Amino acid sequence: SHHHHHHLEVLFQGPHMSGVKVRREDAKKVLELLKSVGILDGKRKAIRDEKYVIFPVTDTNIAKSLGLEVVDVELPMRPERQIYKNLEDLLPREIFKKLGRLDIVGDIAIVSIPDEILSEREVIVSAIRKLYPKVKVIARRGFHSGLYRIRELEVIWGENRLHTIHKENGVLIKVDLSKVFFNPRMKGERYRIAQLVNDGERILVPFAGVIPYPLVIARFKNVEVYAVEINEFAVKLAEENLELNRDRLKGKIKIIHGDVFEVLPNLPNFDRVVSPTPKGVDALSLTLSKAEKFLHYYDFVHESEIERFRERVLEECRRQGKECRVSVRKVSDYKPHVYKVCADVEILS
């Protein structure tokens, strides 16, 4: 006998060759419509010109029932392989250029998205997921708030969580970005100072957070590191991090829950002080006062202020009756015309 038409109609083996032609101002509306109705063809790319977009569809009869103009076109096939290296490869320049730098913490991607391009959130998320297929959370960042410098963060894709375990320089760092400050970009600096350190040193790190600096130093050197942190949630994670890394640390770490400006005057002095100073805070006198051989003092300085910065460090050295060599390094581009810097102070005997 013969077959039912509603069985035969699925048998055609060829590929779809049609799309719908829509005004650009209608493109987002129509893309949503095509997906909801279920006739968007994932096999092919959409294309555009100056005025119109063409979406690939799987059923032109249904497209007509949606009031859409059907066109016969030769659209590109979806890519089977990927060779994108960076975000710029996946976004138009007008969008990418407005994006802040992207940071990865554990399996969380963090990016700043100005209100002006927030309307492009979908393609931004798509681009980030493509570039980082292992990321499980994407968050939009604002500024740091409060004494603990917690970053304003909104999850815009993935799991609704801001805690993860970050890997750096051979150590494991538990972080909860909803509760503590963390600085992934300091990876190079932390490794640098860890290599400079010598076995046997006693080292102080004020403003220590979940103690990434003490962990990286103690990973590579048999030293004792005192860490001072005021945020009790950061202290908790620091304790958990110490236990998490305990069997891989050569050195020892002492975590002190407290206010740096209260704690340091009551401490003994140290061979080396490493101060990842909160932006805007001046802890130069106090941290130098605890150093016997080396201070590494981080700060944020406008380029035109860079020389004044060095002379202020030298002034404090003389003020404390110390003879020092001071070297200033640009550590990172913080924003236009402003650098994160480090004063390396060598105290001479």
Ligand X SMILES: CSC[C@H]1O[C@@H](n2cnc3c(N)ncnc32)[C@H](O)[C@@H]1O
Query: Footprint of ligand X on this chain (CB under 6 A)?
Result: 147-149, 180-181, 207, 209, 228-231, 234, 259-261, 278
156 is in an annotated binding site: no
First to last CA, the chain: 105
CB proximity list for 106: less than 8 A, separation 6 or greater: 164, 165, 166, 167, 175
Asked whether the beta carbons of 116 and 98 are under 8 A apart, the reply is yes
In the complex with ligand X, which residue's Cβ is closer, 12 or 143? 143
SS3 state at 75: coil
Shortest approach of ligand X to residue 277 CB, angstroms?
Answer: 8
- Residue among 75 and 230 whose Cβ is closer to ligand X: 230
Contact by Cβ (8 Å): 186, 215: no
- 229 labeled binding residue: yes
* Coil/strand/helix, residue 85: coil
H-assigned helices in 249-333? 260-263, 284-289, 306-319
By C-beta, is 282 or 333 nearer to ligand X? 282
| For ligand X, the closer CB: 127 or 230 | 230
Residue 283 C-beta: closest distance to ligand X, Å:
8
Answer whether 70's CB lies under 8 Å from 60's CB: yes
- As a whole number of angstroms, the longest Cα–Cα distance in the chain is 106
By C-beta, is 19 or 278 nearer to ligand X?
A: 278
Tell me the closest approach of the beta carbon of residue 214 to ligand X, in angstroms: 13
**Smallest distance from the beta carbon of 145 to ligand X, in angstroms?**
11
Q: Is 111 annotated as a binding residue?
A: no
Question: Would the annotation count 173 as a binding residue?
Answer: no
Asked if residues 253 and 171 have their Cβ atoms less than 8 Å apart, the reply is: no
The verdict on whether residue 260 carries a ligand-binding annotation is yes
As a whole number of Å, the CA-based R_g of the chain is 28
271 is in an annotated binding site: no
Nearest distance from residue 99's CB to ligand X, in Å? 23
Name the minimum Å distance from CB 181 to ligand X: 4
166 strand-pairing partners: 173
Per DSSP, the three-state class of 192 is helix
Binding residue ranges? 190, 207, 229-230, 259-260
Binding residue ranges for S-adenosyl-L-methionine? 190, 207, 229-230, 259-260
